[PDB]
Structures are given as structure tokens and as C-alpha cells.
Design a protein around this nucleic acid. Structure first.
Length: 53
RNA sequence: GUGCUCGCUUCGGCAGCACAUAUACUAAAAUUGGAACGAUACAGAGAAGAUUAGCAUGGCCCCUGCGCAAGGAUGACA
């Protein structure tokens, strides 16, 4: 009925997802098992690609 | 198994004869695995432009100053 305003949204490139820009959602996404798995896979991929390079 | 052979043979039996002709995912049981968008937990504006303030540039019209080029009209006795 008046000026709509959207909450900020943060892209997670480790998890290839979207979450909310606020303390609780970002903090909960940090402690997710999927987030840790994606971070570990990203680190492993970085090291493997550097070795192949 | 039933019934029959003028069979051996006795009613205790035997040999042969006619009919019977090929079912089943076959299964009662064996085990260890991988598992929600269902709940709770979090977030939740779950549909808007992703803006407005100056100055300078660019266009048009005058005015003023300097330079370049080409010129017009005029003025001056002893």
C-alpha cells in the first residue's frame, strides 16, 4: 500500500545459496554442516588445482 | 489303483492286459543400507526507483575584450 522495502540478501558463494544479511541467519549458516562441507571442498579444490597448475 | 485274462494257479498269491503322463515368480524364511519439506530452531518488507545535490561541458542569441585576414568612410595649417 506504500513504498515496499526489501530486506538485504547475502549470496553465499561457498554454498551457492542466498541467505539474509543479519547476525542470526549468517551466524547459523556459518555453523551448518553443509557450509563446512562446502568450505572444505573449496579449499581442497584450490589446493588440487594449484598442484595441477 | 480299479476291472479283466477261459494264463500259473489258489481264492492267500503270481504273470500280462485297458485307463492315469510331467505342477511350482518356484519362496516360509536371510540380512545390512540409503532415506522429508513433517515438526522444531533461525530469519522473514513474501512485488517498487535501486537514488539527488553542485559545477563544468554541448546547442541557440546577444554584449564586451584581444588576435588574424580582407577591407570601407573621414580628418588635419606653418
Amino acid at each position: 500500500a506504500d513504498y515496499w522495502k526489501s530486506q538485504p540478501k547475502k549470496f553465499c558463494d561457498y554454498c551457492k545459496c542466498w541467505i539474509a544479511d543479519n547476525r542470526p541467519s549468517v551466524e547459523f549458516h556459518e555453523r551448518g554442516k553443509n557450509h563446512k562441507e562446502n568450505v572444505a571442498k573449496r579449499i581442497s579444490e584450490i589446493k588440487q588445482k594449484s598442484l595441477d597448475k
